[PDB]
Design a protein around this nucleic acid. Structure first.
Ligand SMILES: [Mg+2]
Ligand SMILES: [Mg+2]
Ligand SMILES: [Mg+2]
Ligand SMILES: [Mg+2]
Ligand SMILES: [Mg+2]
Ligand SMILES: [Mg+2]
Ligand SMILES: [Mg+2]
Ligand SMILES: [Mg+2]
Ligand SMILES: [Mg+2]
Ligand SMILES: [Mg+2]
Ligand SMILES: [Mg+2]
Ligand SMILES: [Mg+2]
Ligand SMILES: [Mg+2]
Ligand SMILES: [Mg+2]
Ligand SMILES: [Mg+2]
Ligand SMILES: [Mg+2]
Ligand SMILES: [Mg+2]
Ligand SMILES: [Mg+2]
Ligand SMILES: [Mg+2]
Ligand SMILES: [Mg+2]
Ligand SMILES: [Mg+2]
Ligand SMILES: [Mg+2]
Ligand SMILES: [Mg+2]
Ligand SMILES: [Mg+2]
Ligand SMILES: [Mg+2]
Ligand SMILES: [Mg+2]
Ligand SMILES: [Mg+2]
Ligand SMILES: [Mg+2]
Ligand SMILES: [Mg+2]
Ligand SMILES: [Mg+2]
Ligand SMILES: [Mg+2]
Ligand SMILES: [Mg+2]
Ligand SMILES: [Mg+2]
Ligand SMILES: [Mg+2]
Ligand SMILES: [Mg+2]
Ligand SMILES: [Mg+2]
Ligand SMILES: [Mg+2]
Ligand SMILES: [Mg+2]
Ligand SMILES: [Mg+2]
Ligand SMILES: [Mg+2]
Ligand SMILES: [Mg+2]
Lengths: 222, 185, 148, 51, 49, 58, 127, 159
RNA sequence: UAAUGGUUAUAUGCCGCCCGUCUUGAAACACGGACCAAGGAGUCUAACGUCUAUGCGAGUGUUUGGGUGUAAAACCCAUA
RNA sequence: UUUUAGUGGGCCAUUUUUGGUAAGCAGAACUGGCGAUGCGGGAUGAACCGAACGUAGAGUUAAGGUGCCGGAAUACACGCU
RNA sequence: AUGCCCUGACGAGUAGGCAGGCGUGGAGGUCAGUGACGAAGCCUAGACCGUAAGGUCGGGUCGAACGGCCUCUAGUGCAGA
């Protein structure tokens, strides 16, 4: 008469509606990613038909990988990297693109590779390397219940909710991005390309903006 | 390598146990470690911390300080809690009936409390009759009234009591103390 | 206890905690109070202002038993009455049999008014009193008596 | 005690994300696109092949 | 030398003070011999007090 | 001997190892440095405010 | 025998010999930390000896265990042996170096009667 | 030897701003300073009394004391590894109001006003300022604006 | 069971300058050291400062002395 | 908030500098280093490049390389000598 | 229960600071400790424990005393002078 079985019946019930909620919201996101890319593809086709030029929306998210080690850094980019939580080589963080962050990126340009992450790389980074900051204590994500315990107050209940708040820069992007402990990436698996890293990507190195080629590099580092 | 933003392996800077090897005080810490873990009342966390405190961090609380806190509005029937020593005061001539829970009572402060019908209570009797700190009132003695705090921050234009052995004329009342002899401080 | 010192921890290390460059010497600053006005002045001013110079009058052949005037305040004044008899004086607070407190026999030279005796009349045999201490005793209905 | 990787280990791919079953069912990651027959303007291709 | 915020000491130890150190190890010895003397004297100056 | 006279090399590293503090302001500053006429009246303009507060509550 | 335990890993079985103990007879092999300011040992130049540091410390599951799986307990007499009656799968008796030959007989008889592994049951045996 | 006087190295700083020499115009003496106002310190060289030291030129601080012709201004001065409160007695002709604080105080009146019709309806009016967000989609037309530029130019010396 | 493993000697590959010291900088063609045993260098005291522990606490401090003793101990005590 | 040790001989590099024809020169500024620091590379080197260090295993890299010493293509390509 | 356990991060270093330990001579207690059937010392490319200071055991030599633990104390640890 400690009465476990009714509580286990209640808990296994409550998990079932919670996975039902997650399943329909993932279906909601899956349709909205698909129509968004279809609209952009059709908008370019329509503008080319209508003699015009579709100009894309400018990118709202970058993913910043620090590609330089610790020693001999000047004081100003050293502080900006700490405020972007890139405290060691091959660390990664998503950064919402505003003017206040577009000038942080120009300060740390010869130490980082950044660029525009796709849905696939956001999905794979959070799946494989995704950790949470919970009593600071770096908890691996590994279960949707420890996302809802810490981000449910912003309506983020699963791992695919967390990806959705990152790729679509939502109103609670800051709380979802600072929840993620900075991604501890490996070295890239086919190397870097580029016999010398520490020139700009435009001149033939690695650092700076490689706008959509961050996806090749981060998936090699994953 | 890690671009550290903080000193690695930093201790908290707080006592987690008393430095004293008092056997009975370890028992009280053992009693209140359990309470602060299991009760969720904030009284037991404050009390357990104050058991750790050093002798200058537990100044005595006078019985006239006990009586003046019972003059507070609606606090006449609370339980005064002093994690430390309760001392007498003959400067006060009327003492109220009350419950005082302290570590130690001096032989005069035990007299002035039990003569007025009060009770001097050890903190384990307090945890029995008030395990969540119900209707309690923590009193702390004056820390900065110590004779050592006067010499802290002695410097120019500070007014902070020079570390001296000899007092009076010829002892530091000259050049540096009056505008006549040299300069003034 | 010699085992608890840091001499026992400096066994093995060269400089014994004193440094190699500094290289602990006999007297690098001079012995005692050397150069208090010259090279120790930033320590002499700042933590000891007033050391150098003269202050007022010299007293040749000072006897401190002339200056014996220990002060008792009215915040106590009643501790001199013993604790057993004290309660029967505070209650039945009256003139015409008022307690006599030989202040001098307890070893005080002056009575001072720090504050708030009860309203019991007392007879106080003091060598000296202050102005406020005289007034507060009389306002309680007592008297100050001068003795020598 | 041991972090298992979704994108391997289908069991942990289904612990997170119950839509992973439906995505693999309707194949959803190799889905067709409709064949629309838009053609660009004359001025677009002329500007493209311009000297 | 003059050092940190500390009281100025007046230790009078720049004579040859170690020749004139008197340590009273014999406090217990002198007490017995004083008590021996009073017993010796009282026997000598019997009944006188 | 000939010696290096002065340099401010390494002086900002030491200045930031213990983290430069702004001077920790307070509500109610000290009235040192105020016009003494204003402070003199302010003693009375706050005494009478307390009399009109303490009598009105009781 | 003993309890089940993991495989005992030592991480450094080699003795930590003092620098230049091989070179001068006055320098003993007992470990001393090179506190020289020039010392290629202290500065960890490549090619030099290893220094003791806490990373070499033994796994606490298998620490203090003999290869037989027991912690050695030094035993002087029969009474000291009988503090190990219950702990015969964790402790082995080692008869002390100064025990008589006739007293070593009496200890080995009780340890056989109690089932205690004695790790040196051959000192002072006339063979 | 070396010279470290009060107006040392103040050759161009205390100068009088070409074709604006002469008397101080009267709006400087009609400005009203209250305690707590945030003021920019710029020394007028033509007034030599009440003149700030060269450290405080361009510094901005808070009025704390008001006397007959002078404000008392509090400036934070970095001294070693901390800031120290500096209290300056400057006459009001070295002093102007900081125009940023007029821009702030209107936004306080604006955010009070914008939250009023947030209370009529439609709560959380989103009154915080945001940075320059990235641009949106465009569709650039070509009607009358066909894209044309030629190549890089060759090298000519054109002396 | 010396089969694995340990130790040890040797061989092979790659690496490895002589320690201590002062110095901005030492393998230096800077100083000390041929070797070994034993000895060998922050101590004690007077007066204090911060801190901490303990006793009592508006007081405190028995041990200068006195009493006592199983006798340099312990125990007890007035006036200062 | 208290208290206290050592230090108070410095040196190098990038950039901007004064003097000097110039200096492995004498003096400044900002930063990063060395001193106080090993590791991979520059054959070798306090300071350069890469990267800072618990003990191990596996993977991937950096700077630098891949005829042979010497791990790694006497690779592919267009020329020049 | 300065225990047992869960979780996370971290680990360079001279001068210097502090903490936790190892060892020596002597003291109070204890183990009714070891010991002429062999104490202590010494030798031992024999064994074991500890990251280490060190601790333990076996063998040989030897011949009278000497250890563990809880504490006290210092003329207490050497490669250099
Ligand atoms: Mg590969
Ligand atoms: Mg050291
Ligand atoms: Mg030295
Ligand atoms: Mg002079
Ligand atoms: Mg100098
Ligand atoms: Mg070993
Ligand atoms: Mg070793
Ligand atoms: Mg040795
Ligand atoms: Mg060096
Ligand atoms: Mg000048
Ligand atoms: Mg065999
Ligand atoms: Mg065998
Ligand atoms: Mg083998
Ligand atoms: Mg070699
Ligand atoms: Mg040096
Ligand atoms: Mg050397
Ligand atoms: Mg030699
Ligand atoms: Mg020689
Ligand atoms: Mg010699
Ligand atoms: Mg020796
Ligand atoms: Mg100096
Ligand atoms: Mg020097
Ligand atoms: Mg020049
Ligand atoms: Mg070095
Ligand atoms: Mg290189
Ligand atoms: Mg190198
Ligand atoms: Mg070369
Ligand atoms: Mg080469
Ligand atoms: Mg391993
Ligand atoms: Mg090869
Ligand atoms: Mg370390
Ligand atoms: Mg240790
Ligand atoms: Mg001993
Ligand atoms: Mg025996
Ligand atoms: Mg023997
Ligand atoms: Mg040998
Ligand atoms: Mg003999
Ligand atoms: Mg010695
Ligand atoms: Mg040595
Ligand atoms: Mg020797
Ligand atoms: Mg040495």
């Amino acid at each position: 008469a400690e009465q476990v079985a009714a509580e286990r019946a209640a808990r296994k019930a409550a998990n079932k509606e919670k996975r039902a909620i997650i399943l329909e919201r993932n279906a909601a996101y899956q349709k909205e990613y698909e129509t968004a890319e279809r609209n952009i593809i059709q908008a370019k086709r329509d503008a080319k038909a209508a003699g015009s030029y579709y100009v894309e929306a400018q990118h709202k998210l970058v993913f910043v990988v620090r590609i330089k080690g610790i020693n001999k850094i000047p004081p100003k980019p050293r502080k900006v990297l700490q405020l972007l939580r890139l405290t060691r080589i091959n660390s990664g963080t998503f950064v919402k693109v505003t003017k206040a962050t577009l000038e942080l990126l120009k300060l740390i340009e010869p130490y980082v590779a950044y660029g525009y992450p796709s849905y696939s790389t956001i999905r794979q980074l959070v799946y494989k390397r995704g950790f949470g900051k919970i009593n600071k204590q770096r908890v691996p994500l590994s279960d949707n219940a420890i996302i809802e315990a810490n981000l449910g107050k912003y309506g983020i209940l699963s791992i695919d909710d967390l990806i959705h708040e990152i790729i679509t820069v939502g109103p609670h992007f800051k709380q979802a991005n600072n929840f993620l402990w900075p991604f501890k990436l490996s070295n890239p698996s086919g190397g870097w390309g580029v016999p010398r890293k520490f020139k700009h990507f435009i001149q033939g190195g690695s650092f700076g903006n490689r706008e959509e080629f961050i996806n090749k590099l981060v998936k090699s580092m994953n | 390598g890690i671009d550290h933003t903080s000193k690695q392996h930093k201790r908290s800077g707080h006592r987690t146990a008393p430095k004293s090897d008092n056997v009975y005080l370890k028992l009280l810490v053992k009693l209140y470690t359990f309470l602060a873990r299991r009760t969720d009342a904030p009284f037991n966390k404050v009390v357990l911390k104050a058991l750790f405190l050093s002798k200058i961090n537990r100044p005595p609380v006078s019985v006239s300080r006990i009586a003046r806190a019972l003059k507070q509005e609606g606090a006449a029937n609370k339980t005064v809690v002093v994690v430390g020593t309760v001392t007498d005061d003959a400067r006060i001539f009327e003492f109220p009936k009350t419950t005082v829970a302290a570590l130690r009572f001096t032989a005069g402060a035990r007299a002035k409390i039990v003569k007025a019908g009060g009770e001097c209570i050890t903190l384990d009797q307090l945890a029995v009759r008030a395990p969540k700190g119900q209707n309690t009132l923590i009193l702390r003695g004056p820390r900065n009234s110590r004779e050592a705090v006067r010499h802290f921050g002695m410097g120019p234009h500070k007014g902070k009591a020079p570390r001296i052995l000899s007092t009076g004329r010829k002892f530091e009342r000259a050049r540096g103390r009056r505008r006549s002899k040299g300069f003034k401080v | 206890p010699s085992r608890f010192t840091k001499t026992r921890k400096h066994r093995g290390h060269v400089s014994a905690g004193k440094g190699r460059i500094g290289k602990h010497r006999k007297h690098p600053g001079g012995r005692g109070m050397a150069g208090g006005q010259h090279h120790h002045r930033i320590n002499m001013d700042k933590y000891h202002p007033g050391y150098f110079g003269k202050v007022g009058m010299r007293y040749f052949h000072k006897q401190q038993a002339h200056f014996w005037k220990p002060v008792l305040n009215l915040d106590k004044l009643w501790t001199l009455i013993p604790e057993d008899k004290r309660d029967q004086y505070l209650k039945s607070a009256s003139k015409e049999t008022a307690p006599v407190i030989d202040t001098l026999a307890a070893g005080y030279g002056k009575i001072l008014g720090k504050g708030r005796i009860p309203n019991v009349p007392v007879i106080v045999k003091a060598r000296f009193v202050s102005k406020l201490a005289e007034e507060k005793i009389r306002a309680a209905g007592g008297v100050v008596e001068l003795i020598a | 005690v041991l972090k298992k990787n979704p994108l391997k280990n289908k069991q942990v791919l289904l612990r997170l994300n119950p839509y992973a079953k439906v995505f693999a069912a309707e194949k959803l990651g190799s889905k067709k696109a409709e064949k629309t027959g838009t053609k660009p303007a004359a001025v677009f291709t002329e500007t493209l092949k311009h000297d | 030398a003059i050092s940190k915020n500390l009281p100025i000491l007046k230790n009078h130890f720049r004579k040859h003070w170690q020749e004139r150190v008197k340590v009273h190890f014999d406090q217990a010895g002198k007490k017995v011999s004083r008590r021996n003397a009073r017993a010796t004297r009282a026997a000598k100056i019997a009944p006188r007090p | 001997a000939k010696s290096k006279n002065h340099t401010a090399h390494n002086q900002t590293r030491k200045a930031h190892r213990n983290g430069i503090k702004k001077p920790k302001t307070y509500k109610y500053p000290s009235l040192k440095g105020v016009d003494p006429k204003f402070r003199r009246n302010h003693k009375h303009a706050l005494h009478g405010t307390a009399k009109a507060l303490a009598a009105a509550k009781k | 025998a003993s309890l089940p335990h993991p495989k005992i890993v030592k991480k450094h079985t080699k003795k930590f010999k003092r620098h230049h103990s091989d070179r001068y007879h006055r320098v003993a092999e007992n470990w001393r930390k090179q506190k020289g300011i020039d010392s290629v040992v202290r500065r960890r130049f490549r090619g030099n000896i290893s220094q003791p540091k806490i990373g070499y410390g033994s796994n606490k599951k298998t620490k203090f265990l003999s290869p037989s799986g027991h912690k050695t307990f030094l035993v002087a007499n029969v009474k000291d042996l009988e503090t190990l009656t219950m702990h015969t799968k964790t402790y082995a008796a080692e008869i002390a170096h100064n025990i008589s030959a006739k007293n070593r007989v009496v200890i080995l008889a009780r340890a056989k009667a109690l089932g205690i592994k004695v790790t040196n049951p051959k000192g002072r045996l006339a063979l | 030897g070396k010279s470290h006087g009060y107006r040392s190295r103040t050759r161009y700083m205390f100068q009088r701003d070409f074709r604006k020499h002469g008397a101080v115009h009267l709006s400087t003496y009609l400005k009203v300073y209250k305690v707590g106002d945030i003021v920019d310190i710029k020394a007028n060289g033509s007034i030599q009394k009440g003149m700030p030291h060269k450290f405080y030129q361009g510094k901005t601080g808070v009025v704390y004391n008001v006397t007959k012709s002078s404000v008392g201004v509090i400036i934070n001065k970095m001294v070693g590894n901390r800031y120290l409160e500096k209290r300056l007695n400057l006459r009001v002709e070295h002093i102007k109001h900081s125009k940023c604080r007029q821009e702030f105080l209107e936004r306080v009146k604006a955010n009070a006003a914008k939250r009023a019709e947030a209370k009529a309806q439609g709560v959380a009016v989103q009154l915080k300022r945001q940075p320059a967000q990235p641009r949106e989609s465009r569709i650039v037309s070509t009607e009358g604006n066909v894209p044309q530029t030629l190549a890089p130019v060759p090298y000519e010396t054109f002396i």
